[PDB]
Amino acid sequence: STPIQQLLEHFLRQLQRKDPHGFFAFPVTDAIAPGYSMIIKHPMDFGTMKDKIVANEYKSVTEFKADFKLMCDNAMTYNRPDTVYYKLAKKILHAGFKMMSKERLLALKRSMS
């Protein structure tokens, strides 16, 4: 494993901890959610993000953050605001961006020198 992969796996584990029912663990199918493929054209989930880390597909934390944001945005686009999926996506997007904030990454950059 590489230092980037270890850091991204840590961020992903902490993010997955906020989803105990595993709503974001797997891709959303049309059988589970009707007309999903018709509304969401750029699907994303924690499993796809895990596979990208393992394959060393992320060049930076910004790229990882972009996939996480896409996943939350998709859930907030497809699902109405009063659903468990929209509510969890909004909660984890905020919590995730504070964990991977420019402030926290600058503090990590300073500890790398």
Site residues (vs ligand 5TY, CB under 6 A): 23-24, 28, 32-33, 75, 78-79, 85
Q: In this structure, what are the phi and psi dihedrals at residue 50, rounded to the nearest 5 degrees?
A: -65, -45
Whichever of 37 and 101 has its CB closer to ligand 5TY, that residue is 37
Quickly tell me which residue has 């934390």 as its tokens: 61
Alpha carbons 23 and 20: distance in angstroms, whole number: 8
- Min dist CB 31 to ligand 5TY, Å, is 9
Alpha carbons 34 and 37: distance in angstroms, whole number: 8
Alpha helices in the chain, H assignment, sequence order: 3-16, 36-39, 46-54, 61-78, 84-99, 102-110
- Min dist CB 23 to ligand 5TY, Å, is 4
Whichever of 56 and 83 has its CB closer to ligand 5TY, that residue is 83
Whichever of 3 and 34 has its CB closer to ligand 5TY, that residue is 34
- Min dist CB 22 to ligand 5TY, Å, is 9
